[PDB]
Write an enzyme that holds these catalytic residues in place. Structure first.
Site, PDB file in Angstrom:
ATOM      1  N   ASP A 110      25.568  53.275  71.438  1.00 57.25           N
ATOM      2  CA  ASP A 110      26.286  52.774  70.199  1.00 57.25           C
ATOM      3  C   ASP A 110      26.708  53.980  69.146  1.00 57.25           C
ATOM      4  OD1 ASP A 110      27.870  51.105  69.066  1.00 57.25           O
ATOM      5  OD2 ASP A 110      26.310  50.062  68.182  1.00 57.25           O
TER       6      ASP A 110
ATOM      7  N   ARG B  55      29.771  54.549  61.984  1.00 56.47           N
ATOM      8  CA  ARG B  55      28.801  53.525  61.414  1.00 56.47           C
ATOM      9  C   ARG B  55      27.671  53.851  61.572  1.00 56.47           C
ATOM     10  NH1 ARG B  55      31.712  51.327  65.813  1.00 56.47           N
ATOM     11  NH2 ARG B  55      30.244  50.534  67.316  1.00 56.47           N
ATOM     12  N   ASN B  56      27.090  54.351  62.641  1.00 53.89           N
ATOM     13  CA  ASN B  56      25.589  54.786  63.135  1.00 53.89           C
ATOM     14  C   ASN B  56      25.142  56.079  62.809  1.00 53.89           C
ATOM     15  OD1 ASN B  56      24.514  52.174  63.603  1.00 53.89           O
ATOM     16  ND2 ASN B  56      25.343  52.229  65.575  1.00 53.89           N
TER      17      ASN B  56
ATOM     18  N   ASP C   4      19.989  53.700  65.164  1.00 54.16           N
ATOM     19  CA  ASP C   4      20.214  52.559  66.090  1.00 54.16           C
ATOM     20  C   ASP C   4      20.764  52.832  67.502  1.00 54.16           C
ATOM     21  OD1 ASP C   4      19.933  50.736  63.698  1.00 54.16           O
ATOM     22  OD2 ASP C   4      21.860  50.447  63.597  1.00 54.16           O
TER      23      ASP C   4
HETATM   24  O1  LIG Z   1      15.967  48.852  63.445  1.00 53.58           O
HETATM   25  C1  LIG Z   1      16.984  49.402  63.567  1.00 53.58           C
HETATM   26  N1  LIG Z   1      17.850  49.572  62.482  1.00 53.58           N
HETATM   27  C2  LIG Z   1      17.987  49.349  61.515  1.00 53.58           C
HETATM   28  N2  LIG Z   1      18.731  49.188  60.313  1.00 53.58           N
HETATM   29  C3  LIG Z   1      18.373  48.600  59.212  1.00 53.58           C
HETATM   30  C4  LIG Z   1      16.912  48.289  59.186  1.00 53.58           C
HETATM   31  S1  LIG Z   1      16.239  48.557  60.646  1.00 53.58           S
HETATM   32  C5  LIG Z   1      17.388  50.076  64.967  1.00 53.58           C
HETATM   33  C6  LIG Z   1      16.808  51.377  65.188  1.00 53.58           C
HETATM   34  C7  LIG Z   1      16.203  51.942  64.090  1.00 53.58           C
HETATM   35  C8  LIG Z   1      15.914  53.492  63.919  1.00 53.58           C
HETATM   36  F1  LIG Z   1      15.397  53.670  63.003  1.00 53.58           F
HETATM   37  C9  LIG Z   1      15.867  54.108  65.027  1.00 53.58           C
HETATM   38  C10 LIG Z   1      16.532  53.526  66.224  1.00 53.58           C
HETATM   39  C11 LIG Z   1      16.940  52.260  66.346  1.00 53.58           C
HETATM   40  O2  LIG Z   1      17.533  51.705  67.620  1.00 53.58           O
HETATM   41  N3  LIG Z   1      16.832  49.142  65.977  1.00 53.58           N
HETATM   42  C12 LIG Z   1      15.378  49.054  66.657  1.00 53.58           C
HETATM   43  C13 LIG Z   1      15.588  47.965  67.607  1.00 53.58           C
HETATM   44  C14 LIG Z   1      14.578  47.379  68.204  1.00 53.58           C
HETATM   45  C15 LIG Z   1      14.933  46.380  69.410  1.00 53.58           C
HETATM   46  C16 LIG Z   1      16.284  45.793  69.261  1.00 53.58           C
HETATM   47  C17 LIG Z   1      16.811  45.003  69.842  1.00 53.58           C
HETATM   48  C18 LIG Z   1      15.819  43.786  70.533  1.00 53.58           C
HETATM   49  C19 LIG Z   1      16.531  43.023  71.121  1.00 53.58           C
HETATM   50  C20 LIG Z   1      17.758  42.839  71.602  1.00 53.58           C
HETATM   51  N4  LIG Z   1      18.446  41.766  72.318  1.00 53.58           N
HETATM   52  C21 LIG Z   1      17.676  40.559  72.268  1.00 53.58           C
HETATM   53  C22 LIG Z   1      18.098  39.581  73.128  1.00 53.58           C
HETATM   54  N5  LIG Z   1      19.597  39.338  72.856  1.00 53.58           N
HETATM   55  C23 LIG Z   1      20.366  40.634  72.764  1.00 53.58           C
HETATM   56  C24 LIG Z   1      19.689  41.550  71.938  1.00 53.58           C
HETATM   57  C25 LIG Z   1      18.642  43.782  70.893  1.00 53.58           C
HETATM   58  C26 LIG Z   1      18.241  44.801  70.111  1.00 53.58           C
HETATM   59  C27 LIG Z   1      17.194  46.336  68.277  1.00 53.58           C
HETATM   60  C28 LIG Z   1      16.872  47.655  67.648  1.00 53.58           C
HETATM   61  C29 LIG Z   1      17.501  48.235  66.681  1.00 53.58           C
HETATM   62  O3  LIG Z   1      18.614  47.990  66.492  1.00 53.58           O
HETATM   63  N1  LIG Z   2      18.814  52.101  56.640  1.00 50.06           N
HETATM   64  C1  LIG Z   2      19.968  51.656  56.024  1.00 50.06           C
HETATM   65  N2  LIG Z   2      20.193  52.153  54.975  1.00 50.06           N
HETATM   66  C2  LIG Z   2      21.376  51.815  54.221  1.00 50.06           C
HETATM   67  N3  LIG Z   2      22.484  51.104  54.876  1.00 50.06           N
HETATM   68  C3  LIG Z   2      22.100  50.890  56.245  1.00 50.06           C
HETATM   69  C4  LIG Z   2      20.964  51.199  56.899  1.00 50.06           C
HETATM   70  N4  LIG Z   2      20.915  50.685  57.870  1.00 50.06           N
HETATM   71  C5  LIG Z   2      22.038  50.051  58.268  1.00 50.06           C
HETATM   72  N5  LIG Z   2      22.728  49.954  56.978  1.00 50.06           N
HETATM   73  C6  LIG Z   2      24.123  49.543  56.775  1.00 50.06           C
HETATM   74  O1  LIG Z   2      24.159  48.089  57.103  1.00 50.06           O
HETATM   75  C7  LIG Z   2      25.377  48.183  57.959  1.00 50.06           C
HETATM   76  C8  LIG Z   2      25.218  47.153  59.103  1.00 50.06           C
HETATM   77  O2  LIG Z   2      24.383  47.698  60.075  1.00 50.06           O
HETATM   78  P1  LIG Z   2      24.303  47.252  61.536  1.00 50.06           P
HETATM   79  O3  LIG Z   2      23.705  46.154  61.685  1.00 50.06           O
HETATM   80  O4  LIG Z   2      23.626  48.491  62.359  1.00 50.06           O
HETATM   81  O5  LIG Z   2      25.885  47.153  62.207  1.00 50.06           O
HETATM   82  P2  LIG Z   2      26.752  48.329  62.496  1.00 50.06           P
HETATM   83  O6  LIG Z   2      26.094  49.635  62.741  1.00 50.06           O
HETATM   84  O7  LIG Z   2      27.656  48.352  61.347  1.00 50.06           O
HETATM   85  N6  LIG Z   2      27.670  47.771  63.785  1.00 50.06           N
HETATM   86  P3  LIG Z   2      26.345  47.898  65.235  1.00 50.06           P
HETATM   87  O8  LIG Z   2      27.211  48.925  65.883  1.00 50.06           O
HETATM   88  O9  LIG Z   2      26.425  46.515  65.686  1.00 50.06           O
HETATM   89  O10 LIG Z   2      25.330  48.331  64.793  1.00 50.06           O
HETATM   90  C9  LIG Z   2      25.674  49.457  58.757  1.00 50.06           C
HETATM   91  O11 LIG Z   2      26.911  49.774  59.291  1.00 50.06           O
HETATM   92  C10 LIG Z   2      25.598  50.228  57.229  1.00 50.06           C
HETATM   93  O12 LIG Z   2      26.526  49.927  56.583  1.00 50.06           O
HETATM   94 MG   LIG Z   3      24.072  50.354  63.359  1.00 50.10          MG
END
Ligand SMILES: O=C(Nc1nccs1)[C@@H](c1cc(F)ccc1O)N1Cc2ccc(-c3ccc(N4CCNCC4)cc3)cc2C1=O
Ligand SMILES: Nc1ncnc2c1ncn2[C@@H]1O[C@H](COP(=O)(O)OP(=O)(O)NP(=O)(O)O)[C@@H](O)[C@H]1O
Ligand SMILES: [Mg+2]
Ligand SMILES: O=C(Nc1nccs1)[C@@H](c1cc(F)ccc1O)N1Cc2ccc(-c3ccc(N4CCNCC4)cc3)cc2C1=O
Ligand SMILES: Nc1ncnc2c1ncn2[C@@H]1O[C@H](COP(=O)(O)OP(=O)(O)NP(=O)(O)O)[C@@H](O)[C@H]1O
Ligand SMILES: [Mg+2]
Lengths: 296, 306
Positions: free
Chosen positions: A139, A143-144, A157
């Site tokens: 992905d 945005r990521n 992500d």
């Molecule tokens: O937490 C992450 N993002 C963050 N944003 C902001 C704060 S935390 C990133 C992330 C953060 C990092 F720092 C590095 C890599 C990364 O991937 N994760 C971690 C993670 C773990 C598990 C899953 C996960 C588990 C289950 C499912 N199934 C369940 C059944 N139905 C369909 C979907 C889908 C996804 C997603 C992520 C994920 O999106």
């Molecule tokens: N660690 C972070 N610090 C600040 N903003 C964040 C952080 N992680 C995610 N975001 C913000 O939160 C928004 C929503 O994130 P997310 O749920 O990952 O959706 P996305 O990346 O926009 N689409 P998807 O492709 O579904 O992940 C991101 O696009 C950024 O705008």
């Molecule tokens: Mg994202």
């Protein structure tokens, strides 16, 4: 996977403050961690997934969360913590600048060529690292990519394939067959760079996602961004070849863009590129000592 | 020179007083980078006295040295604003200074933490000595807590900026830190690496007492006389004689007889490998010591320099 790298959190040691946004699988909040026995409130970012989970369902998630807490590269964000409740919450560093897509829109045509090229290099270095760890992003999009500082971006992500749709970033083979490799990640890199060079344009804007595999079959591709010299535009097009093995490798993209970064005005043409700021060493030191001390 | 940002008044704002001392007041604040939408927390010190432009040129010369330090146990100065009263910027420490930390956790601090802090402070002071920088004001209030496991020396290097007036300061006027000073410093108003070692002794005494005031109830007027008579700070109840004797060695009359920071590192590192042998603390068997999972979390969220 050294399991000390992933911190298991009780519900009582953090609070969601505010909503940042949502995507395919979850909702991201501004958060606060309260270390036990302390009075400090530490900003964190928390993602809560839309769909609930069972201990058997959680066993798959923990097994993967351990992998994403084990990345160690300056251009890759790592998972820090998790809270397994009825719904799952994931904790990482909060980035006050947010994601690169919103940052290039906010500064549209206010960003010099040194920065855009530096970013391309940095996204490539992070993607290359995931490849060496044999992790597929699946992905990648602007945005990521998260802005830690304007001079320092980081991939986020990644790695959700072994637990599972962004059609307009996806390679042809992934749309048609759900085939995700590093070479299809190279396709999404090409689309990501096109986002940067257009300051956050939407790809294939008039064209619905249902029709994307047809136009790529027909040989249509995203147009050349005005600021891009031909050398930059053909890297992008090389990333969008039907034959995944004909696409550039991420090690190659690092050498190439880092060569262009050495004389940026030769490879992008931005109006008033001298109106633009450029990364002052004084500015860079201040940013690093204040909010970016990691080793690089 | 690239290591010190010269700041505009418009790119930071003071928000809340955190404390004050001899020469300035410290605020929690925000840095707002030009053309951005982010507000970054910072600490801001505003000096109490206005300075001329010539005084500012001297201050700026020293500020460049203060921004040039690069060591995991020494804080560096980040920026400066040449307002009528000079304003100074560094990282904001949410845990505060170590004096307030030990006072607030007086009943939950074990021997591993206290001894590790002694090692870290000695390490930072020995870097300053290797760079030939004198502190002049070492004390527990001038050690900051980056995390409970990572403390850092702050607020060193002022001596040259005070040289004109230093000899005139009154013992009771609170500009000269009498109860942390070496005897030769009280009498002569000169500060060296070996007088800093004496302040280190007092600093450790503060930690071992969980933040008692040194020579409490004795006016600063009278400190020089009681030291000349051989009196020193008493043995903290948690200290074994081993730890108290290092402390007393830091307070010998002959500056050259005191231990060196190089040696204090080694001695406290030795004790830090068997802490319960050297410090006797109620409940030390239960006292928290940080697992790798919690230290990893702490570092990623607020202490990446490692
Ligand atoms: O937490 C992450 N993002 C963050 N944003 C902001 C704060 S935390 C990133 C992330 C953060 C990092 F720092 C590095 C890599 C990364 O991937 N994760 C971690 C993670 C773990 C598990 C899953 C996960 C588990 C289950 C499912 N199934 C369940 C059944 N139905 C369909 C979907 C889908 C996804 C997603 C992520 C994920 O999106
Ligand atoms: N660690 C972070 N610090 C600040 N903003 C964040 C952080 N992680 C995610 N975001 C913000 O939160 C928004 C929503 O994130 P997310 O749920 O990952 O959706 P996305 O990346 O926009 N689409 P998807 O492709 O579904 O992940 C991101 O696009 C950024 O705008
Ligand atoms: Mg994202
Ligand atoms: O900024 C510092 N603390 C901070 N707390 C919070 C935010 S900033 C540290 C500091 C921070 C570091 F990171 C490293 C070293 C250091 O010293 N400074 C810097 C500094 C510069 C100048 C002076 C100064 C200049 C002149 C005078 N005279 C003028 C003549 N009449 C008598 C008084 C007195 C003091 C003090 C300091 C100082 O206290
Ligand atoms: N960088 C910081 N982040 C958070 N708090 C700080 C920081 N620096 C200093 N402080 C707090 O601000 C208080 C006042 O600092 P300062 O003005 O230097 O006086 P002091 O060191 O306490 N006394 P003196 O030694 O007389 O200057 C300190 O004691 C700490 O409680
Ligand atoms: Mg101080």
């Amino acid at each position: 996977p050294n399991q000390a790298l992933l911190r298991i959190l009780k519900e009582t040691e953090f609070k969601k403050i505010k909503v940042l946004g949502s995507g395919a699988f979850g909702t991201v909040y501004k958060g606060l961690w309260i270390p036990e026995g302390e009075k400090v409130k530490i900003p964190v970012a928390i993602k809560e997934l839309r769909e609930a989970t069972s201990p058997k369902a959680n066993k798959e998630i923990l097994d993967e969360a351990y992998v994403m807490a084990s990345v160690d590269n300056p251009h890759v964000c790592r998972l820090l913590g998790i809270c397994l409740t009825s719904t799952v919450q994931l904790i990482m560093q909060l980035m006050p600048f947010g994601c690169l897509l919103d940052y290039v829109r906010e500064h549209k045509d206010n960003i010099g060529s040194q920065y855009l090229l530096n970013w391309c290099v940095q996204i490539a270095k992070g993607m290359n690292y995931l490849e060496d760890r044999r992790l597929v992003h699946r992905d990648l999009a602007a945005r990521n990519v998260l802005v830690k500082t304007p001079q320092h971006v980081k991939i986020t992500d990644f790695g959700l394939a072994k637990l599972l749709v962004p059609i307009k970033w996806m390679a042809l083979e992934s749309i048609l067959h759900r085939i995700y490799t590093h070479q299809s990640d190279v396709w999404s890199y090409g689309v990501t760079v096109w986002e940067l060079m257009t300051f956050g344009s939407k790809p294939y804007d008039g064209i619905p996602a249902s029709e994307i595999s047809s136009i790529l079959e027909k040989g249509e591709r995203l147009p050349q961004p005005p600021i891009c010299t031909i050398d930059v535009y053909m890297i992008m097009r090389k990333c969008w070849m039907i034959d995944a093995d004909s696409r550039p490798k991420f090690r190659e993209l690092i050498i190439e863009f880092s060569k262009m970064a050495r004389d940026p005005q030769r490879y992008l043409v931005i109006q008033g590129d001298e109106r633009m700021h450029l990364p002052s060493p004084t500015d860079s030191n201040f940013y690093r000592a204040l909010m970016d001390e990691e080793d690089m």
